[PDB]
Design a protein around this ligand. Structure first.
Ligand SMILES: CCCCCCCCCCCCCCCCCC(=O)OC[C@H](COP(=O)([O-])OCC(O)COP(=O)([O-])OC[C@@H](COC(=O)CCCCCCCCCCCCCCCCC)OC(=O)CCCCCCCCCCCCCCCCC)OC(=O)CCCCCCCCCCCCCCCCC
Ligand SMILES: CCCCCCCCCCC(CCCCCCCCCC)(CO[C@H]1O[C@@H](CO)[C@H](O[C@@H]2O[C@@H](CO)[C@H](O)[C@@H](O)[C@@H]2O)[C@@H](O)[C@@H]1O)CO[C@H]1O[C@@H](CO)[C@H](O[C@@H]2O[C@@H](CO)[C@H](O)[C@@H](O)[C@@H]2O)[C@@H](O)[C@H]1O
Ligand SMILES: CCCCCCCCCCCCCCCCCC(=O)OC[C@H](COP(=O)(O)OCCN)OC(=O)CCCCCCCCCCCCCCCCC
Ligand SMILES: CCCCCCCCCCCCCCCCCC(=O)OC[C@H](COP(=O)(O)OCCN)OC(=O)CCCCCCCCCCCCCCCCC
Ligand SMILES: CCCCCCCCCCCCCCCCCC(=O)OC[C@H](COP(=O)(O)OCCN)OC(=O)CCCCCCCCCCCCCCCCC
Ligand SMILES: CCCCCCCCCCCCCCCCCC(=O)OC[C@H](COP(=O)(O)OCCN)OC(=O)CCCCCCCCCCCCCCCCC
Lengths: 82, 54, 481, 56, 90, 50, 106, 85
């Protein structure tokens, strides 16, 4: 059950990650770091906020911020070296 | 010193099958690319005979 | 040849008494023949290539060499070649997955299975509305008989569902095809984008075509037949129904609807997006409260089909490519999951209730590993074709309508939920008390599963490998001024 | 014959060769589908993969 | 006096096969639960609760999605939009 | 259910032929965990209040 | 509700054990745990002889309420038991022979 | 690792009871002694003793099985019946 918790909360994060990737591919035409960092300073700010918000929800789940933390303490069911 | 379980042969049928197919595929890829560098075209392309577009 | 090969069939039947080795050999030859056709297929051309006509008035029993075309037309382009390859990859596996569990009247069973496969393969060759419709319907009586005679306890209701629902949608498609026939006096797919009907008549013809699409895909809210039919079908029926037959609807959208009714399709796209979003969300949530393994697996297909619909109706090249890739990857992975639940577990225990299953990892570690792999493939883990299809479909959907595709992005989570909820209970915990230990997966079962996993992995790592057959297709159907 | 062979194999756990019911199950066990699936179907699939690679 | 022909010899219908040992120990309670869950449609009735679910999912939710999908049709264009540019077209 | 009683399936805390509720899938061992120390309403109060 | 009976004894003994478990759960320091434990035993001793029904039932109800007011969020359990960190870890498999399901195929 | 024996369990329980101050006598503690009768332990006192036993061998006694042990031999056979202790 602890494993199911972790995988599902991080799939919630990954859903917002996929949303962000779709926005990024549509707006920038690419996923490469070079091009996105080349042209990001000219981009409309509402679009950048949409992209960054989706990416931050993903990172929030990964880094266990107070929105989506619950799996972090459940993960102590695994062996200690894990 | 921990106990010993029965001896098991390293190269099982699955090892031989999967390694053989994979390595043969890579060997075929390299042979085709070399045959292309020499002959001018991939050796696999020679078997391609579609009707002309016209 | 045909005379001699019929003699060969007859003698084999006389001596062996089981037709199945001959059918396996014939299907393997068919796959090799299709690969030879692919070798000789020209990719730098958007024209149909291996054309032939049947039942022309000048040669009713031969091929037509006449200046008047009144028979049924057949031929292939890249789009149809893709699905034909999927079909001929799948057919021998559907024969091999029932090699040992059919014992009474097995010759008829294998004949039905092979006939259904051949009908679908011919359906992908059809080049006009009438030939397409004929091969579209011809599977229904074969499926009715197969499910009625060789299905599980509730297979009578299931056979009646698989006949009646599909007939119901097909008859409205038939209304549309009749209207096209009498209004245009032509029915073929080669030049049907050259005919521009008035917008009003377009709007009317679209409705019949889309009702048939809604039942065959299926889409919400006319999906409820598919879990029953999948659950009660024998294994070959389920494999064909999930891997091939549902793909006919996506193919129908591309081949029958978009080239002819372009403007009406533009007008109707938001309604399609409503229906597909309802399909994805509601069927994904309904899966969470199912107690039959085969029903759960069947419900999964509906949500993936919704994602594919959203891609194929997105009016973008990425969306259409994603829809096709998703169709192929689902055709690999869903038959594997049906093999696990209705072929391996069901042949060992003869029961499908989820309460009975727990902790299979102890005695069957290999089956548990297969379950884990196929589960993460089914929920779109990257490097799997399922991820490529879903990701591209969602890109196209989001471009077509940012709000609707953005909300559609929740399918990642929802699919993860129902699938991993099943696999968590199947593999973890202490071995169940209700079942005795059985054999782990056999060599035949592993062979089938390995074929399907390697296929999905190959197109997951390099999806571009399909592009040489599809790059015309991703431009043939979008409507931009 | 098939009924006798497979029933003896299934109950006794012994192969009916060697000739009195030997236990030697390790190897020498080919199923009736292997030749077709490994020498026709599988090479066909490999050829399809090669063709797709070079067609691309 | 009207009887089937004496020339007909009918035997039993046996499907044959090997009776395997019973690997599953059936629980009657679980089977009854599964039967109730599988054939729920045969017992369904329209009450306040079930009707409320019917109205939420078959009427309300489609109407919300439809309003959204017909209001926002053609509204957004995002490709390469720059600062100060409108991302909306209307 | 107290886990020191004996059950035919110890992990699931179920005995053979025990009747199932119609919503049994929401009450078995694999269902989401339930917390006893506070009532759900009071826990909502505390969480919102924090 | 008997002033002195086997059922009454079972109840009071279960409850006094509950009190000592609770006190151990709540108090980190061992010395103070012994203090509070001694005091619990004193409280349990003083009300031992209550005879009339109303007073005994009232004292039992009020001590039940006291215990419920002092319940611990997470008791201490040894790891190998139901609430334990090691419960059902590495459960040794049942030893069991392979039942066959198919005449032809293992 | 570490493994206990029946005599180790017995020696630990005997030292445990010897440490208790409410007991009648130390020399009179037998393997088959009754705590209720021979040692004259109160209703609550035997509870305190069972709690001491579980705090000593690191196990958890349910209510129904705690009240069942009446003799020292009963305690020893119970503690040897438990794998992790
Ligand atoms: C790169 C080249 C790779 C290309 C493909 C190579 C794969 C070859 C497979 C093989 O060997 O044949 C076996 C296969 C039958 O399998 P089988 O072994 O007989 O199974 C029966 C028993 O299981 C067999 O016996 P068993 O029961 O005892 O085995 C138990 C089972 C285990 O039980 C399980 O639980 C299995 C779990 C699932 C496993 C399946 C997933 C496999 C994943 C592959 C590995 C992933 C690695 C991670 C990614 C790495 C990427 C490289 O074993 C397995 O099946 C897994 C085998 C894993 C072997 C790995 C060891 C490799 C050796 C490496 C050596 C390295 C040498 C270095 C030397 C360097 C010197 C310089 O027969 C075939 O050849 C099938 C041909 C398929 C070809 C690919 C299909 C392509 C065409 C598909 C369509 C094209 C795209 C779709 C288009 C759609 C329409 C347009
Ligand atoms: C709109 C406003 C409707 C307002 C009416 C509520 C309604 C319609 C629901 C239709 C929904 C349609 C949705 C479909 C799509 C629409 C686009 C459902 O009312 C339901 O409420 C449920 C919950 O309270 C009850 O379930 C359980 O009940 C309890 C058992 O213990 C538990 O208390 C509860 O916990 C359970 O759950 C149901 O029994 C009840 O039918 C009907 O309720 C009422 O209407 C009348 C007249 O017909 C019905 O007949 C009456 O009673 C009959 C003997 O009784 C006799 O004939 C006669 O005396 C009389 O005629 C009754 O049915 C009555 O109740
Ligand atoms: C801000 C809101 C944050 C929402 C986060 C996303 C919620 C989805 C996470 C689901 C989940 O993790 O449930 C896992 C659950 C295990 O939980 P538990 O039993 O307590 O673990 C014991 C281990 N110590 O095991 C389960 O219960 C699985 C059963 C299904 C769980 C999901 C049921 C659907 C409910 C909707 C989930 C979210 C919907 C989209 C948002
Ligand atoms: C009952 C359901 C309704 C039935 C209505 C339809 C019944 C059809 C009966 C099946 C017969 C169709 C398949 C045979 C026709 C193909 C014969 C042929 O030669 O194709 C001609 C085509 C071009 O050939 P040609 O112009 O002569 O030039 C050759 C140069 N060397 O050459 C080619 O390009 C090769 C074409 C390959 C086509 C692949 C066909 C795959 C399936 C073949 C068998 C299907 C059997 C289905 C049985 C169930 C009934 C549907
Ligand atoms: C419900 C179930 C319904 C079932 C529907 C099935 C209908 C099947 C109808 C069969 C007609 C279609 C046959 C496909 C044509 C393939 C072919 O060409 O066969 C060879 C020969 C004619 O060949 P030809 O015209 O010379 O063209 C080839 C030149 N390279 O063809 C012939 O010589 C004729 C041999 C076919 C005879 C068929 C007899 C009917 C079946 C008994
Ligand atoms: C949107 C509405 C969806 C929900 C309503 C579904 C219809 C319905 O209420 O049930 C079917 C109903 C008979 O069933 P009913 O009596 O309502 O319920 C039995 C126990 N709940 O059906 C009826 O009320 C009978 C109506 C029959 C009218 C037939 C119309 C002509 C049919 C073609 C000729």
């Amino acid at each position: 059950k602890s494993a199911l918790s972790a995988v599902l909360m991080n799939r919630f994060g990954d859903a917002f990650f996929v949303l962000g990737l779709c926005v990024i591919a549509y707006v920038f035409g690419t996923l490469n770091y070079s091009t996105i960092f080349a042209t990001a300073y000219l981009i409309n700010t509402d679009l950048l906020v949409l992209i960054m918000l989706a990416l931050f929800i993903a990172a929030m789940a990964k880094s266990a911020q107070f929105g989506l933390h619950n799996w972090l303490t459940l993960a102590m069911e695994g062996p200690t070296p894990v | 010193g921990p106990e010993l379980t029965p001896a098991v042969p390293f190269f099982q049928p699955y090892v031989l099958k999967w390694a053989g197919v994979s390595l043969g595929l890579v060997a075929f890829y390299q042979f085709n690319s070399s045959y292309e560098a020499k002959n001018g075209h991939t050796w696999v392309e020679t078997f391609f005979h579609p009707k002309s577009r016209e | 040849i045909l005379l001699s090969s019929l003699y060969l069939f007859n003698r084999i039947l006389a001596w062996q008494g089981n037709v199945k080795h001959f059918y396996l050999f014939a299907s393997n030859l068919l796959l090799l023949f299709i690969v030879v056709l692919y070798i000789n297929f020209n990719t730098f051309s958007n024209s149909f290539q291996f054309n032939f006509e049947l039942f022309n008035s000048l040669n009713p029993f031969g091929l037509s060499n006449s200046d008047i075309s009144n028979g049924l037309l057949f031929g292939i382009d890249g789009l149809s070649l893709t699905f034909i390859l999927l079909t001929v990859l799948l057919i021998p596996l559907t024969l091999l997955g029932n090699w040992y569990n059919i014992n009474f009247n097995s010759n008829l069973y294998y004949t039905l299975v092979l006939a259904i496969g051949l009908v679908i393969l011919l359906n992908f060759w059809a080049l006009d509305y009438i030939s397409f419709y004929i091969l579209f319907e011809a599977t229904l009586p074969l499926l009715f008989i197969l499910i009625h005679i060789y299905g599980s306890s509730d297979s009578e209701r299931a056979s009646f569902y698989v006949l009646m629902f599909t007939l119901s949608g097909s008859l409205f498609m038939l209304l549309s095809i009749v209207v096209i026939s009498i209004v245009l006096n032509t029915t073929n797919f080669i030049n049907h984008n050259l005919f521009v009907l008035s917008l009003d008549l377009q709007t009317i013809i679209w409705l019949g075509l889309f009702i048939a699409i809604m039942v065959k895909t299926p889409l919400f809210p006319i999906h409820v037949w598919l879990p029953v039919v999948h659950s009660e079908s024998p294994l070959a029926g389920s494999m064909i129904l999930a891997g091939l037959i549902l793909k006919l609807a996506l193919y129908a959208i591309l081949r029958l609807l978009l080239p002819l009714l372009c403007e009406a399709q533009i007008l109707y796209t938001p309604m399609i997006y409503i229906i597909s979003l309802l399909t994805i969300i509601l069927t994904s949530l309904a899966t969470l409260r199912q107690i039959d393994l085969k029903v759960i697996i069947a419900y999964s297909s509906i949500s993936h089909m919704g994602i594919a619909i959203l891609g194929v109706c997105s009016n973008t090249s990425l969306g259409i490519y994603g829809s096709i890739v998703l169709g192929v990857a689902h055709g690999f992975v869903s038959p594997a999951l049906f093999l696990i639940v209705g072929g391996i577990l069901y042949d060992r225990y003869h029961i499908r209730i989820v309460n009975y299953y727990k902790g299979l990892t102890t005695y069957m570690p290999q089956l548990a590993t297969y379950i884990i792999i196929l589960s993460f493939a089914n929920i779109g883990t990257p490097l799997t074709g399922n991820f490529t299809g879903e990701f591209l479909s969602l890109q196209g959907g989001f471009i077509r309508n940012p709000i609707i595709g953005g909300i559609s992005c929740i399918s990642v989570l929802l699919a993860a939920i129902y699938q991993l909820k099943l696999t968590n209970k199947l593999t973890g915990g202490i071995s169940s008390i209700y079942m005795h230990r059985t054999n782990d997966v056999t060599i035949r079962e592993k062979f089938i599963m390995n074929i399907l996993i390697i296929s999905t992995l190959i197109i997951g790592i390099c999806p571009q490998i399909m592009y040489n057959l599809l790059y015309w297709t991703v431009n043939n159907y979008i409507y931009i001024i | 014959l098939k009924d006798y062979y497979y029933n003896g194999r299934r109950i006794l756990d012994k192969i009916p060769v060697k000739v009195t019911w030997e236990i030697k199950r390790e190897g020498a066990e080919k199923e009736d589908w292997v030749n077709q699936m490994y020498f026709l179907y599988a090479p066909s699939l490999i050829l399809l993969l090669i063709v797709m690679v070079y067609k691309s | 006096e009207l009887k089937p022909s004496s020339a007909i010899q009918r035997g039993p219908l046996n499907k044959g096969g090997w009776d395997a040992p019973h690997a599953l120990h059936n629980d009657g309670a679980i089977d009854r639960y599964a039967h109730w869950r599988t054939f729920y449609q045969e017992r369904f009735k329209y009450t306040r609760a079930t009707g409320k679910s019917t109205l939420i999912f078959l009427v309300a939710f489609p109407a919300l999605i439809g309003y959204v999908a017909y209001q926002s049709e053609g509204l957004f264009e995002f490709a390469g939009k720059r600062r100060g540019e409108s991302v909306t077209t209307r | 259910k107290n886990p020191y009683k004996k059950y035919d399936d110890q992990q699931d805390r179920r005995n053979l032929e025990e009747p199932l509720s119609v919503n049994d899938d929401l009450y078995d061992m694999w269902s989401p965990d339930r917390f006893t120390h506070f009532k759900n309403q009071d826990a909502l109060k505390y969480f919102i209040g924090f | 509700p008997v002033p002195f009976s086997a059922a009454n004894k079972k109840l009071v003994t279960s409850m006094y054990r509950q009190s000592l478990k609770l006190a151990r759960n709540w108090i980190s320091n061992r010395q103070l745990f012994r203090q509070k434990a001694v005091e619990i035993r004193h409280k349990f001793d003083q009300n031992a002889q209550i005879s009339n029904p109303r007073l005994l039932a009232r004292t039992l109800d009020e001590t039940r309420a006291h215990l419920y007011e002092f319940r611990h969020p997470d008791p201490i359990v040894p790891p190998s038991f139901p609430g334990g960190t090691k419960y059902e870890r590495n459960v040794p498999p049942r030893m069991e022979k392979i039942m066959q399901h198919n005449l032809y195929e293992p | 690792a570490h493994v206990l024996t029946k005599d180790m369990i017995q020696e630990r329980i005997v030292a445990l009871l010897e440490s208790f101050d409410k007991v009648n006598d130390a020399k009179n503690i037998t393997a088959t002694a009754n705590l209720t009768s021979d040692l004259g332990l109160d209703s609550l006192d035997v509870v305190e003793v069972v709690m001491a036993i579980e705090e000593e061998f690191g196990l958890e006694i349910p209510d129904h099985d705690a009240d069942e042990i009446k003799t020292v031999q009963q305690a020893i056979d119970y503690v040897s019946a438990q794998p992790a202790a």
